[PDB]
């Protein structure tokens, strides 16, 4: 989410704006994304290594 213009940009911004129906992509689940779009249960487990 952009700080200056308060707009979502990226795959999430495409999902909010109705252009894309779903995002089957390597997208990390975070709090700010969960507020604006809905996620499934995570399909991959990853961490800093």
């Amino acid at each position: 989410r952009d700080a200056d213009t308060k707009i979502w940009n990226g795959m999430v911004g495409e999902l909010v704006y109705g252009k894309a129906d779903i995002a089957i992509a390597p997208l990390t689940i975070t709090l700010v994304r969960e507020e604006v779009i809905d996620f499934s249960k995570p399909f991959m487990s990853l961490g800093i290594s």
Binding site: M11, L15, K19, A20, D21, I22, A23, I24, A25, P26
Partner: peptide
């Protein structure tokens, strides 16, 4: 017909 957005990351 469903639009599946994605990114090119290997």
């Amino acid at each position: 017909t469903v639009v599946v957005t994605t990114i090119l990351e290997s």
